Amino acid sequence: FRKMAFPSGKVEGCMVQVTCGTTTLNGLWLDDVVYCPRHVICTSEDMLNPNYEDLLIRKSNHNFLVQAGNVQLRVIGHSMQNCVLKLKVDTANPKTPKYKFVRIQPGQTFSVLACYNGSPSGVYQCAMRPNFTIKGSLFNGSCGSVGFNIDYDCVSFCYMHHMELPTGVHAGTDLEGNFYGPFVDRQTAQAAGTDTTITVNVLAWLYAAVINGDRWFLNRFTTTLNDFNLVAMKYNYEPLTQDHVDILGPLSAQTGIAVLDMCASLKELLQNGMNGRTILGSALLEDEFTPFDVVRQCS
Amino acid sequence: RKMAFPSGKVEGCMVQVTCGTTTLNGLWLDDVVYCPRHVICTSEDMLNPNYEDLLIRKSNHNFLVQAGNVQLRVIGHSMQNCVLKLKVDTANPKTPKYKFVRIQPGQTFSVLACYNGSPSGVYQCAMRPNFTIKGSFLNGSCGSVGFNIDYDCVSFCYMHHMELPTGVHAGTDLEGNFYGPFVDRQTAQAAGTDTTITVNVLAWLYAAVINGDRWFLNRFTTTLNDFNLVAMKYNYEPLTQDHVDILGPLSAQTGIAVLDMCASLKELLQNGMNGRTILGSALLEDEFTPFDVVR
Questions:
Q1: Of A115, A143, A158, A298, which is the active-site residue?
Q2: Taking every annotated instance into account, which residue ranges of this chain make up the domain Peptidase C30 (chain B)?
Q3: CATH code, domain carrying A82
Q4: Which structural domain, as residue segments, surrounds residue A246?
Q5: What is the dihedral sign for C-alpha A66, A71, A73, A74?
Q6: What's the Cα-to-Cα distance from A262 to each of A226, B114, B153, rounded to whole Å?
Q7: A218 and A136 together in one domain
């Protein structure tokens, strides 16, 4: 069962390069605004304890070089929204898709278009970890690359890459500049918290396995939400809520396996392992498919 | 992370092809639409299709080609091996720079999975040693294509034709020649035992050393023959002297001789991971080529 990224064409046509002094990163060009991480205005000296309000008052439009391929876009205004810099430009992007800015929850999934200095390089599907980091690609200049979902012809942008954390994972904001997780855009000591497995996604993936004919892990038992959660916490799994059970309802109806029955199967898999078997061709449980993703893909 | 290529250049080439009651995907490049020739088959025809006989009975107007909301007029048709080539009225204004290439098992590429002309998702994969592809959920994804992009040029290497009984996919290059022993006929054909792409695992281990992970190395070496005798017991592909030569650059970069990395792999197969990960993976990854790894 292969994870897929969304087709990236609609976002490719929005990627540009933003340069401020010695610093270059990626920007997102939608109509006549370019969005990018505000730390593009920072020197290395400023990045130790930057005062962004003061640093931007000292900048003018001529400080910003924006290039869309082989075309310079002239900046005619600049402002900040939280941690995102907004550059008003000469020209509306003729390739702007229908789009929205949305904020996602930990455990939800999206595609990332990894870009280097305005040039799209690759696309991958990922989940926002419960500790609010993204286990991401190995790039050097991918700052400002964005994450998104597509529904019909509408691109929902949910993520912009700002920082690489010492453990090798990525941290960022939504497109309104609000950070995901307890991180700041500063060269200081910060580390990802202890991550956990996304339980509701593992359950969704077990439902996908049942829809695809792999049923060896099903058993006769049921558990309770309370006692499953005690097994979850003991195995570094997120707790399961009544809302999670409700989200899994369509898959329980389709397969005939109640959610607390599937929790019983997962509880046994966590205590006794796979005993040499695989679930979807995998000896490890996967937690980067949401219930929405599985409904979308399977039913 | 295994990344796919940005799919935009291929998205602009996907169309829907309908013949009778059968519909699948086509690839529109310049004034030609490429699609599986079994678009001219019903389900029953697939048991024993005679493609020459089925095709001689068609006119251009039997082929309905839709590019979004625009019908494309077919003005000629021709069969090349297992691919149908529909000449249309209009050259695709979105045609990228492109080439057709035939790949070898072990090579990687991205697939743009499409349903009835509409792009649905993109994934990165490898052509397995048994000439199949582990595919995606979409039922009617026939005609979806696989590709690499190098310097803004799309090299198309794969077109999906057939779903095999175990759930994997089989197909052709863009000249219509199947990969492997498969045919565009519903027979009892099945994927053979798959094996692991050894040269790709070794390239990935080098990537891990280059990125700072060294825990799996040991003090041993191996002969090539002893490595292959062991690796085959784990259903790994044999490693050839070509493969050893290909890894030379990474060997030079890391100061780890190729057969020393082979000795490490032997131990990894014997021991498993013991709870650890190598890059971000709890599994030995075999879908990064040595070309992929250098950058």
A1: A143
A2: 1-295
A3: 2.40.10.10
A4: 199-297
A5: positive
A6: 15, 32, 47
A7: no
